[PDB]
Amino acid sequence: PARICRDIELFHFDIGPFENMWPGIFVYMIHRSCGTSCFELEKLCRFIMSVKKNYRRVPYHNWKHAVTVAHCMYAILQNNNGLFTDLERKGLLIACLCHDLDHRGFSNSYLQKFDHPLAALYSTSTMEQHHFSQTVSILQLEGHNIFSTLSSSEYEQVLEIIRKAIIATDLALYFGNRKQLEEMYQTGSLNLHNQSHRDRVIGLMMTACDLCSVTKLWPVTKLTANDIYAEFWAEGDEMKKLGIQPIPMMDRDKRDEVPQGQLGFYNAVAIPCYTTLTQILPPTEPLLKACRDNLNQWEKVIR
Numbered sequence: 001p002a003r004i005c006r007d008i009e010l011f012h013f014d015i016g017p018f019e020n021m022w023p024g025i026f027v028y029m030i031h032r033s034c035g036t037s038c039f040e041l042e043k044l045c046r047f048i049m050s051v052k053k054n055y056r057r058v059p060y061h062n063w064k065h066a067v068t069v070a071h072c073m074y075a076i077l078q079n080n081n082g083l084f085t086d087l088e089r090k091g092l093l094i095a096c097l098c099h100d101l102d103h104r105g106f107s108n109s110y111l112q113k114f115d116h117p118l119a120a121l122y123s124t125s126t127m128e129q130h131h132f133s134q135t136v137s138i139l140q141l142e143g144h145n146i147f148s149t150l151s152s153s154e155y156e157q158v159l160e161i162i163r164k165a166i167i168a169t170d171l172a173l174y175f176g177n178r179k180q181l182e183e184m185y186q187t188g189s190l191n192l193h194n195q196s197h198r199d200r201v202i203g204l205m206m207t208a209c210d211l212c213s214v215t216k217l218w219p220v221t222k223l224t225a226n227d228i229y230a231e232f233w234a235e236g237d238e239m240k241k242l243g244i245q246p247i248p249m250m251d252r253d254k255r256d257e258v259p260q261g262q263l264g265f266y267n268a269v270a271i272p273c274y275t276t277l278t279q280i281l282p283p284t285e286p287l288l289k290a291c292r293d294n295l296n297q298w299e300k301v302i303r
């Protein structure tokens, strides 16, 4: 539709409530970023539908979130033409679509405390190693190898782009990554031709996309927070059932402190994330501007 063709280019686009339109929205973004003659369409469509099937009906880390995160990546890539290679752009959009595959609405910390079998298999970045494993499993289904026209070397290359990008959505990793990037910026040593540096920038891009609810317009941001807390509070209930006091953010008894919690997150995570991103990629400034506006809104709630 014309309104979507126009507004999909905005960083603060919302993908709407019609689920059956989201696959086509993703294909549109893939074709604009990577070209039409670079995925076989029927195979891409089959892949997308299997990815959708492997997302769960949870409040926040669901299929809608996957496509939303992919859209943020599309907007970053569209506004930074010439920086990322064709393979990187394909890899990143696919990584975003797949990055929360099979998410149950629980953190890595909860999996560890539960003694879930995934935590024995993957001791660090547990869910994220699982998300990548699931991505590979879907790619290996008959007729689902969207990368079948790549050489073996390019296939290995894009799967590694995807693995690194999915792992980078473990927010635990963000703090250290952003610290290193900020030092590289301050000292003028960031080198986008250096693969280690380049991987870090991509990781920050993945964080920025994953957190992008705080870069929407206030009505969208506020509504999305309801879904984020529905998951967090259910996890806190589950902590209590294990006999463990949950942290305030997961404890529904502490919900009156939501605005203070939001301030904490914007100050410690979101504003620094988008500030560092804008320093490296100036055209991403609208994400930072929107984030600052939402911080002001939470401050107003407190007032």
Ligand SMILES: COc1ccc(-c2nc(-c3cccs3)[nH]c2-c2ccc(OC)cc2)cc1
Pocket (backbone or CB within 6 Å): 213, 214, 225, 228, 229, 248, 249, 250, 254, 255, 256, 257, 258, 260, 261, 262, 264, 265, 268, 269
């Ligand atoms: C964008 O979505 C959210 C942002 C922040 C939170 C959040 N809520 C609380 C609460 C404390 C008490 C009652 S609620 N704390 C946070 C929070 C503070 C700091 C963070 O990272 C450093 C991370 C999280 C929840 C959702």
Ligand SMILES: [Mg+2]
Pocket (backbone or CB within 6 Å): 099, 100, 169, 170
């Ligand atoms: Mg995740």
Ligand SMILES: [Zn+2]
Pocket (backbone or CB within 6 Å): 061, 065, 069, 099, 100, 169, 210
């Ligand atoms: Zn996510």
